[model samples]
Target chain A: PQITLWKRPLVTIRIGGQLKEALLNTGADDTVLEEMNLPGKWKPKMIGGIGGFIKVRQYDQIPIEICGHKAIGTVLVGPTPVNIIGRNLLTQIGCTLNF
Target chain B: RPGNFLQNRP
Candidate 1:
């Protein structure tokens, strides 16, 4: 199915048995969530956002169910302003822009 | 990892 970029490329995703909304970002390589604590061996990662840069905790091999589609990929947690579902996990869920 | 054009601030 084709993913449409509407007013907001938002979708409901389930992570760690918690359902939350996330923005589908084609411009990103990794998923980022704000203020969500996840269980994993975290690594320090500095990511460039809309402002400048911020340090985040990157957790690899995390399973996230997006719109009922299951995908395992990397998820970053920190003081991110918004929850973003990047192309890394989006690809696995067959998200493609029809343009 | 390197060439991702996402954001700068918030």
Candidate 2:
């Protein structure tokens, strides 16, 4: 689906059998989600955000369904205000910034 | 990993 550049492109996603909303952020290289429990091990990581930098739990090779599109990649868990579907998974889902 | 557009600060 073609998305507009002017407005926020919010989409529904399915991960770990749970449904959630996330923003399609082209500028971000990795996906970030709110703090949640998943069955696996994650490494501590620091990533930059809108305000500054924050520590997050990085889980790799996780499967997620973004707007019905399937993808497997790295996902970060932290105290994020909202979930974000960044370029890492976005590329797998064939999302591009089209004018 | 890179910076996110989401508002998350330490």
TM-score of chain A of each: 0.92, 0.93
- lDDT (tens digit, per residue) of candidate 2 on A16-65: 97999988887788899988887798999999856788899999999999
Docking class of 2: acceptable
State the local distance difference test value for candidate 2: 0.85
TM-score of every model? 0.86, 0.88
Candidate 2's error at A28, in angstroms?
0.8
Give one digit per residue, the lDDT tens place, for model 1 in A1-99: 456654677789999989999888888888889877677699999888455677899899999999999999888898777788999998998887776
Q: Compare the candidates by lDDT and give the number of the best one.
A: 2
Query: Residue A80 deviation, candidate 1, in Å?
Result: 1.1
DockQ of 2: 0.49
| CA deviation > 4 Å runs, candidate 1 | A1-3, B1-10
RMSD of each: 2.5, 2.8
Location of the lowest summed lDDT over 10 successive residues in candidate 1 chain A: A1-10
To one decimal place, how large is model 1's interface RMSD in Å?
3.2
